[PDB]
């Protein structure tokens, strides 16, 4: 029985919450708080351990961009610090290949990163890899066919509909087919050999539209839209279904959790988080 973990987020200020949802019984578990509050972070799992990567601590009295990597062990209910990244990365994108964490783009003050780094848990080390062709903050990251895709985001001037792909063996990036919609702060995941891009911000409105990339045809196709428009939403895949958590709709910090069934092409509200928030880190273990 795997759980959907939600770490950090934002409501008035950056949060420390670590909560886990059980889709089987609909229950929420209140787990050990993050040591440092963060929003704009990303979550991932390697060998049953949860990782909270980058982000920013937004407090009423000041902001602190994060280069931190923290590891949560569900068996001990304890957070442990890891080696930090080379640079702080707020609005980061994260992906896992062969038990290695890829930290993609994000921001540090005025800097919009195109840089990409990789973490080796067995050595507790980060190393820079080939940078992206585009500077991307609020980037969605997905792993498919042992390739790392970086989708949408913001380059510092414009919000992007463009997407690119990383080849770990060759250590190089190549541009792929651009999405139908400009999306920054969208939820990006992989389900049944397809990349999904849900919600985000186009420059004028928070989106409820969802589009899917098919590798064989190299095309992006719209699927059923979500019930709620949302930007800076958390996203994950659990037992063949997509789960979207919170985000900002332009008025409210959502507590809404929607579930997408690819067999019926339908979204349904499954639960509510304990409180509304945006910019959470999400993973399943």
């Amino acid at each position: 029985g795997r759980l959907i973990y939600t770490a950090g987020g934002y409501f008035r200020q950056s949060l420390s919450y670590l909560e886990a949802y059980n889709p089987s019984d609909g229950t929420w578990l209140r787990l050990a708080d993050l040591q440092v509050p963060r929003s704009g972070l990303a979550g991932c799992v390697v060998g049953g351990l949860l990782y909270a990567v980058g982000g920013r601590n937004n407090s009423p009295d000041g902001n602190t961009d994060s280069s931190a990597l923290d590891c949560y062990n569900p068996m001990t209910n304890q957070w442990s610090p890891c080696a930090p990244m080379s640079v702080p990365r707020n609005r980061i994108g994260v992906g896992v290949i062969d038990g290695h964490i890829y930290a993609v783009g994000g921001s540090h003050g005025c800097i919009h990163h195109n840089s990409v780094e990789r973490y080796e848990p067995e050595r507790d080390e980060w190393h820079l890899v080939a940078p992206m062709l585009t500077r991307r903050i609020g980037v969605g990251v997905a792993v498919l066919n042992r390739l790392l895709y970086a989708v949408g985001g913001f380059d510092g001037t414009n919000r992007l509909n463009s997407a690119e792909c990383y080849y770990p063996e060759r250590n190089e990036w190549r541009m792929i087919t651009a999405m139908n919609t400009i999306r920054s702060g969208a939820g990006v995941c992989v389900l049944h050999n397809c990349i999904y891009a849900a919600g985000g911000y186009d420059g004028q409105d928070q989106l409820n539209s969802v589009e899917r990339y098919d590798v064989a045809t190299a095309t992006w196709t719209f699927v059923a839209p979500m019930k709620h428009r949302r930007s800076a939403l958390g996203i994950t895949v659990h037992q063949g279904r997509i789960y979207v958590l919170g985000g900002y709709d332009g008025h409210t910090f959502l507590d809404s959790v929607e579930c997408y069934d690819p067999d019926t092409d339908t979204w349904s509200e499954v639960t509510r988080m304990t409180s509304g928030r945006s910019g959470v880190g999400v993973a399943v273990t």
């Binding site: 934002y10 929003s39 704009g40 937004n58 609005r91 609020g138 913001f154 920054s184 702060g185 985000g200 911000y201 928070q206 930007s231 800076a232 900002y248 332009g250 910090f253 945006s278 910019g279």
Partner: peptide, 7 residues
């Protein structure tokens, strides 16, 4: 403080 994140 922005439309994308609500910060």
């Amino acid at each position: 403080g922005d439309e994308e994140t609500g910060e």
